[PDB]
Design a protein around this ligand. Structure first.
Ligand SMILES: Cc1[nH]c(-c2cccc(NS(C)(=O)=O)c2C)c2c1C(=O)CCCC2
Length: 120
């Protein structure tokens, strides 16, 4: 099935981001008290983590392959927003984002995006 394939591909891609060096910081949502950042959810109004994306792929919340890309990019956009350009967190965010964008090409996930935009 069309939706079954890019669901499978999105699961493999999000799993590789979780195994990427330093990717564990994007796995779960930030605990404001534990991570010593009490203003995180005053700055980030649309939080997103790898586990959030995995749940949506598990429950079947995505209707279009672009919805997966937007949630993942939201993680890296929240990262570059709250974290200073040179910090350790921002560095790893830029690293995984570059890895994620290259995976969308080598896995062919963009092909599901291209065919989906013409359908709609
Ligand atoms: C996307 C993101 N993730 C994390 C995070 C979460 C759990 C554990 C760790 N690791 S640790 C060794 O406790 O510092 C980090 C960095 C943070 C973060 C931020 O936006 C900055 C503020 C909180 C740190």
């Amino acid at each position: 099935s069309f939706n079954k394939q890019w669901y499978l591909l999105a699961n493999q891609i999000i799993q590789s981001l979780s195994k990427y060096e330093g990717g564990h910081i994007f796995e779960k949502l930030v605990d404001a008290k534990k991570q010593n950042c009490p203003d995180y959810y005053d700055v980030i109004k649309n939080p997103m983590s790898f586990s959030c994306v995995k749940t949506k792929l598990k429950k079947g919340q995505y209707g279009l392959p672009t919805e997966f890309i937007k949630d993942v990019q939201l993680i890296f956009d929240n990262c570059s927003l709250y974290n200073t350009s040179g910090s350790l967190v921002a560095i790893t965010g830029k690293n995984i984002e570059a890895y994620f964008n290259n995976q969308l090409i080598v896995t062919g996930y963009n092909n599901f995006v291209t065919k989906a935009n013409t359908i709609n």
